[PDB]
Design a protein around this ligand. Structure first.
Ligand SMILES: COc1ccc(C2=NN(C3CCN(C(=O)CN4C(=O)CCC4=O)CC3)C(=O)[C@@H]3CC=CC[C@H]23)cc1OC
Ligand SMILES: [Mg+2]
Ligand SMILES: [Zn+2]
Length: 329
């Protein structure tokens, strides 16, 4: 009933689970490529979600290992380590002081579970690639948020495997509420939704109320779900806000993925996608573009919403932006 030495070293790294910049890759190595399972289990125990939702612990572990196993290890970016990172980053964003006591335990469970499933069974190519290749997935989802619809369907279907139904003790009301929130959240991770989500988040910041404290008032579903959607979307787009050692690893992985899709697009005479030609795409300029056009406008607006809680994050992002800029020859 005492840990192995490797389990102990893992446990000590997981003491950082409430911090931005957790050594997620080290967790992946130390857990035997189970970062998603160990991070999720840590979070669920820390937030007391097993007791609140009467989730049997063997069921939770069984589902999480099954979920993690449906992430592709042969995909460089959209794998279980990315899922783990998004979960952990959501977990940190949920604890921001501006949001203290705002969300219910079911909303928290929704954001975390959504984060965990949000890229499951990702094949490592884009929606447009799937549509253009006449792929089964694209056909199934009548070309609309093909990947995101699939991540949802798989995340939910896996609950039906042996001893996997982590929601077995929720009421039907709880489950229907949870399910809707999870679907709303995952579907908002499709980048085709980014401009409208951001536009809505800016509107909310313009007309923002607070309960004196400095804490946000969110008194209808539209607003509550929009904040959760944008929060998970920020987590999904959090790579350039992390310390540079982490960010570069993410960049390597996204470029490997993109370059592999670019290889398959070139071979079939297809129009090669943005940043996916390994001959004609500069990594550093791509990252500066990503930050300027997508990541900084989102995070700046998030930092407004939760001011001043996200200042250090936004600083890191701006530092990384300058680092990448300064390395352009
Ligand atoms: C760490 O590094 C990255 C991590 C994730 C992504 C994602 N990117 N994307 C879209 C691809 C096409 N996009 C663009 O090229 C947009 N854009 C401009 O218009 C100017 C320059 C620029 O970047 C939008 C984002 C994804 O869809 C991935 C899946 C989900 C979330 C983000 C991921 C990109 C990264 O490095 C560029
Ligand atoms: Mg995705
Ligand atoms: Zn993702």
């Amino acid at each position: 009933g005492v840990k192995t030495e490797q389990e102990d070293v893992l446990a000590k790294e997981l003491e950082d689970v409430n911090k931005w910049g957790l050594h997620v890759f080290r967790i992946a190595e130390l857990s035997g490529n189970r970062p998603l399972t160990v991070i999720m289990h840590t979070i669920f125990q820390e937030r007391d979600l097993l007791k609140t939702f009467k989730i049997p612990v063997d069921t939770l572990i069984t589902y999480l290992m099954t979920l993690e196993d449906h992430y592709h290890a042969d995909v460089a970016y959209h794998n279980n380590i990315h899922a783990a990172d998004v979960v952990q980053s959501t977990h940190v964003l949920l604890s921001t002081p501006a949001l203290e006591a705002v969300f219910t335990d079911l909303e928290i469970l929704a954001a975390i579970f959504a984060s965990a499933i949000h890229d499951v069974d990702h094949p490592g190519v884009s929606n447009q690639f799937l549509i253009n290749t006449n792929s089964e997935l694209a056909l199934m989802y009548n070309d609309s948020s093909v990947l995101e619809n699939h991540h949802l369907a798989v995340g939910f279907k896996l609950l039906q495997e042996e001893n996997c139904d982590i929601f077995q003790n929720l009421t039907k009301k709880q489950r229907q509420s949870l399910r809707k929130m999870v679907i709303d959240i995952v579907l908002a991770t499709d980048m085709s939704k980014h401009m409208n989500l951001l536009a809505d988040l800016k509107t909310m910041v313009e007309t923002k109320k607070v309960t004196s404290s400095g804490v946000l008032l969110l008194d209808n579903y539209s607003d509550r779900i929009q904040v959760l959607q944008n929060m998970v979307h920020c987590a999904d787009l959090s790579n350039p806000t992390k310390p540079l050692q982490l960010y570069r690893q993410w960049t390597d992985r996204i470029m490997e993925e993109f370059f592999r899709q670019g290889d398959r697009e070139r071979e079939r005479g297809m129009e090669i996608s943005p940043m996916c030609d390994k001959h004609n795409a500069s990594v550093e300029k791509s990252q500066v573009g990503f930050i300027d056009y997508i990541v900084h406008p989102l995070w700046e607006t998030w930092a407004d919403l939760v001011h001043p809680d996200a200042q250090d994050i936004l600083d890191t992002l701006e530092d990384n932006r300058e680092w990448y800029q300064s390395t352009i020859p």
